[PDB]
């Protein structure tokens, strides 16, 4: 879905937008390297806990992830 | 964690808005009542597909249901 697209388009918007690798993203959020990289390509089966634990690692408010997300679906779905 | 806990919440806010029952929820939305019973008590192994679901069942979008984790976040947190 739109939806699921999107939850990974803005982890890895934001990811890149912090000059940060795969691998750093991992060890930042505790989920090791082959999640991430699975989670960025399908978030479908991605946790609201491991959500949480990705915001972190980013060091993203939920409040602003979540706010990035509504404005990607507003405007482009 | 607070958003955990308000995940949780706003499901089971906006199904009593809908005037839902757990076992309504759970025929809506694909997902067992033992499911959804239990994401409403802990979301941290909820799923964005499932989460997708949910909001089906509840005929909520994606946005309204954001933006509403996003004021209990603001105003309580």
């Given at each position: 879905?739109?939806?699921?697209?999107?939850?990974?388009?803005?982890?890895?918007?934001?990811?890149?937008?912090?000059?940060?690798?795969?691998?750093?993203?991992?060890?930042?959020?505790?989920?090791?390297?082959?999640?991430?990289?699975?989670?960025?390509?399908?978030?479908?089966?991605?946790?609201?806990?491991?959500?949480?634990?990705?915001?972190?690692?980013?060091?993203?408010?939920?409040?602003?992830?979540?706010?990035?997300?509504?404005?990607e679906?507003?405007?482009?779905?």
């Amino acid at each position: 879905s739109f939806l699921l697209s999107k939850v990974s388009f803005v982890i890895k918007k934001i990811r890149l937008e912090k000059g940060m690798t795969q691998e750093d993203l991992a060890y930042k959020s505790n989920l090791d390297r082959t999640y991430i990289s699975g989670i960025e390509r399908n978030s479908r089966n991605l946790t609201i806990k491991s959500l949480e634990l990705i915001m972190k690692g980013l060091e993203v408010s939920d409040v602003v992830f979540f706010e990035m997300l509504i404005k990607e679906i507003l405007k482009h779905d």
